[PDB]
């Protein structure tokens, strides 16, 4: 989101975009309402997060 111009800068290099929206949240809402694949995608995501 917003980043004001600095007094002495060439590149703003805002990381605001990365910490939230671009990578996951919009690519997720491109495709189908299931209820079913998310229960198993989250099941195997939390079953993969193991030592």
């Amino acid at each position: 989101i917003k980043v004001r111009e600095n007094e002495p800068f060439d590149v703003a290099l805002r990381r605001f975009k990365r910490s939230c929206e671009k990578a996951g949240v919009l690519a997720e809402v491109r495709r189908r309402e299931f209820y079913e694949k998310p229960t198993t995608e989250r099941k195997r995501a939390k079953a993969s997060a193991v030592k």
Binding site: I1, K2, V3, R4, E5, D10, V11, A12, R14, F16, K17, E21, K22, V25, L26, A27, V29, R30, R31, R32, E33
Partner: protein, 117 residues
Amino acid sequence: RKQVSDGVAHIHASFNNTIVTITDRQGNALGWATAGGSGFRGSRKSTPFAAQVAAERCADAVKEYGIKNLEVMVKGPGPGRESTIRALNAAGFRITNITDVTPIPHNGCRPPKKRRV
């Protein structure tokens, strides 16, 4: 002509095409340029190169307004957008704000099915 001196660069990167619209702070468009209207139809209109030449071409065609400052508003994902704002400060603009204004529903409408490719 009309000498606005500050605007907003609405860049609308999608997966297939980036479309850059330079406007004023009221929201009235002053001139636009798409990646698909700069040659390279098809698999090549969704690249960072096509977006940057789209932004170069949208920096042209607003010379009649004397824009020096502009905010950048970014929609959608895309191979564009990042390169796009680069082309803007390669065209003498003082880039002030970079907001990302991608529309995110708060679980609204059902998205389409697709793609068993």
